[PDB]
Design an enzyme around this catalytic site. Structure first.
Site, PDB file in Angstrom:
ATOM      1  N   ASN A  31      39.161  -1.698  15.151  1.00 29.12           N
ATOM      2  CA  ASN A  31      39.353  -1.588  16.585  1.00 29.12           C
ATOM      3  C   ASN A  31      40.440  -0.590  16.959  1.00 29.12           C
ATOM      4  O   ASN A  31      41.043  -0.697  18.018  1.00 29.12           O
ATOM      5  CB  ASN A  31      39.637  -2.986  17.180  1.00 29.12           C
ATOM      6  N   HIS A  64      46.650  -0.997  17.356  1.00 29.25           N
ATOM      7  CA  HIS A  64      47.460  -2.177  17.655  1.00 29.25           C
ATOM      8  C   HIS A  64      48.501  -1.873  18.732  1.00 29.25           C
ATOM      9  O   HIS A  64      49.104  -0.805  18.735  1.00 29.25           O
ATOM     10  CB  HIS A  64      48.228  -2.654  16.415  1.00 29.25           C
ATOM     11  N   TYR A  87      51.119  -9.120  10.761  1.00 32.68           N
ATOM     12  CA  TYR A  87      50.076 -10.058  11.187  1.00 32.68           C
ATOM     13  C   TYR A  87      50.347 -11.518  10.785  1.00 32.68           C
ATOM     14  O   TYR A  87      49.425 -12.333  10.695  1.00 32.68           O
ATOM     15  CB  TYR A  87      48.705  -9.610  10.662  1.00 32.68           C
ATOM     16  N   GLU A 136      58.110  -6.383  15.841  1.00 26.47           N
ATOM     17  CA  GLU A 136      57.253  -5.384  15.203  1.00 26.47           C
ATOM     18  C   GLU A 136      58.005  -4.067  15.013  1.00 26.47           C
ATOM     19  O   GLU A 136      57.856  -3.377  13.994  1.00 26.47           O
ATOM     20  CB  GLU A 136      55.957  -5.215  16.003  1.00 26.47           C
ATOM     21  N   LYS A 148      45.269   2.837  13.650  1.00 20.09           N
ATOM     22  CA  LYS A 148      44.690   2.156  12.507  1.00 20.09           C
ATOM     23  C   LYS A 148      43.840   3.083  11.656  1.00 20.09           C
ATOM     24  O   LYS A 148      43.478   4.173  12.101  1.00 20.09           O
ATOM     25  CB  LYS A 148      43.875   0.947  13.006  1.00 20.09           C
TER      26      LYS A 148
HETATM   27  N1  LIG Z   1      36.805 -11.019  12.209  1.00 16.83           N
HETATM   28  C1  LIG Z   1      37.703 -11.276  13.194  1.00 16.83           C
HETATM   29  N2  LIG Z   1      38.886 -10.609  13.225  1.00 16.83           N
HETATM   30  C2  LIG Z   1      39.771 -10.884  14.206  1.00 16.83           C
HETATM   31  C3  LIG Z   1      39.443 -11.881  15.231  1.00 16.83           C
HETATM   32  N3  LIG Z   1      40.486 -11.962  16.081  1.00 16.83           N
HETATM   33  C4  LIG Z   1      41.405 -11.060  15.624  1.00 16.83           C
HETATM   34  N4  LIG Z   1      40.981 -10.426  14.512  1.00 16.83           N
HETATM   35  C5  LIG Z   1      41.719  -9.392  13.760  1.00 16.83           C
HETATM   36  O1  LIG Z   1      43.129  -9.623  13.778  1.00 16.83           O
HETATM   37  C6  LIG Z   1      43.828  -8.574  14.448  1.00 16.83           C
HETATM   38  C7  LIG Z   1      44.872  -9.225  15.336  1.00 16.83           C
HETATM   39  O2  LIG Z   1      44.158 -10.096  16.207  1.00 16.83           O
HETATM   40  P1  LIG Z   1      44.661 -10.284  17.721  1.00 16.83           P
HETATM   41  O3  LIG Z   1      46.132 -10.309  17.858  1.00 16.83           O
HETATM   42  O4  LIG Z   1      44.028 -11.515  18.314  1.00 16.83           O
HETATM   43  O5  LIG Z   1      43.965  -9.010  18.443  1.00 16.83           O
HETATM   44  P2  LIG Z   1      44.600  -7.627  19.025  1.00 16.83           P
HETATM   45  O6  LIG Z   1      45.977  -7.822  19.610  1.00 16.83           O
HETATM   46  O7  LIG Z   1      43.648  -7.250  20.146  1.00 16.83           O
HETATM   47  O8  LIG Z   1      44.598  -6.579  17.925  1.00 16.83           O
HETATM   48  C8  LIG Z   1      42.767  -7.888  15.296  1.00 16.83           C
HETATM   49  O9  LIG Z   1      43.115  -6.524  15.570  1.00 16.83           O
HETATM   50  C9  LIG Z   1      41.508  -8.074  14.469  1.00 16.83           C
HETATM   51  O10 LIG Z   1      41.446  -7.165  13.376  1.00 16.83           O
HETATM   52  C10 LIG Z   1      38.138 -12.564  15.125  1.00 16.83           C
HETATM   53  O11 LIG Z   1      37.785 -13.437  15.974  1.00 16.83           O
HETATM   54  N5  LIG Z   1      37.360 -12.201  14.108  1.00 16.83           N
HETATM   55 MG   LIG Z   2      47.940  -9.184  18.884  1.00 17.75          MG
END
Ligand SMILES: Nc1nc2c(ncn2[C@@H]2O[C@H](COP(=O)(O)OP(=O)(O)O)[C@@H](O)[C@H]2O)c(=O)[nH]1
Ligand SMILES: [Mg+2]
Ligand SMILES: Nc1nc2c(ncn2[C@@H]2O[C@H](COP(=O)(O)OP(=O)(O)O)[C@@H](O)[C@H]2O)c(=O)[nH]1
Ligand SMILES: [Mg+2]
Lengths: 134, 134
Positions: free
Chosen positions: B113, B116, B50, B127, B9
């Site tokens: 973070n 991905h 996403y 993906e 990222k």
């Molecule tokens: N602000 C915020 N961003 C989130 C949250 N959950 C997910 N995101 C964003 O959305 C992306 C995809 O979310 P997710 O699939 O749940 O997490 P990942 O698989 O750990 O990257 C994440 O990398 C975060 O940037 C949240 O609770 N708050």
């Molecule tokens: Mg995810």
């Protein structure tokens, strides 16, 4: 600002040193401008890249090595990037490459030497256009 | 053998952690099968990547972040690559990601973070087809 062409050679892949090599260049603050992963570069490309060595006795063996595994081609950009990355790379010859350089720390062979970097502005332009024709 | 899709990222480029992250996956003996550098990913690929989150409050800010700098998309191959790389990645929430993981050691934000990784066989296929239509 200058751009130089770097190849990560198949031996870096075999030895799991890809990140180690890229990280040394990254830590010196050079920025990636383009990057291409090759599961196997075409021999013709390799022959073009090394056209200036076509009459050397090692030409064909070196071409074989260079198609023996993957390569990553990278264009790096930064002030005096060409000479600076050449100094980090280290000398081709394992009797000369300096501890602290990529080859000096990690390479033990004149052929399997982990990394190519352009040696001059003239060759950078050439090599960049071979690997990144667009 | 499985293939999984990883994005490095823009925060990794900003903080010069690209090699550090790739290195952790390389040391675990996973192999790069495809790789593409994006100076700036097109908004549409990010929104499709996403798509599951399109109605979430954080969707637009996340997409904005994801086009704020370069990314690298990588397909990694290895036995149970999907679940193992996910384990290396660590929890999205910096209150939960374990030391020893990429995010546990290096990330301090739920959005910025660093990495991905595909979360399942089905999402990996999807993906991969987005980033390497081929
Ligand atoms: N602000 C915020 N961003 C989130 C949250 N959950 C997910 N995101 C964003 O959305 C992306 C995809 O979310 P997710 O699939 O749940 O997490 P990942 O698989 O750990 O990257 C994440 O990398 C975060 O940037 C949240 O609770 N708050
Ligand atoms: Mg995810
Ligand atoms: N002198 C020499 N060069 C070799 C030999 N085998 C392969 N080469 C290769 O030829 C490549 C191009 O040579 P050169 O431009 O002088 O070296 P470089 O810029 O340090 O990579 C080097 O990376 C070596 O891998 C060998 O047996 N002797
Ligand atoms: Mg040379």
């Amino acid at each position: 600002l200058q751009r130089t062409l770097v190849l990560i050679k198949p031996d870096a892949f075999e030895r799991s040193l890809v990140a180690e090599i890229m990280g040394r260049i990254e830590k010196k603050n050079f920025k990636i401008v383009s990057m291409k992963f090759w599961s196997k570069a075409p021999r013709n490309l390799i022959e073009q890249h090394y056209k200036e060595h076509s009459e050397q006795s090692y030409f064909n063996d070196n071409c074989d090595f260079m198609v023996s595994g993957p390569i990553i081609s990278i264009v790096y950009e930064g002030t005096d990037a060409i000479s600076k990355i050449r100094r980090l790379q280290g000398n081709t010859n394992p009797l000369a490459s300096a501890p602290g350089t990529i080859r000096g720390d990690l390479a033990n062979d004149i052929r399997e030497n982990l990394i190519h970097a352009s040696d001059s502005e003239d060759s950078a332009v050439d090599e960049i256009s071979i690997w990144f024709p667009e």
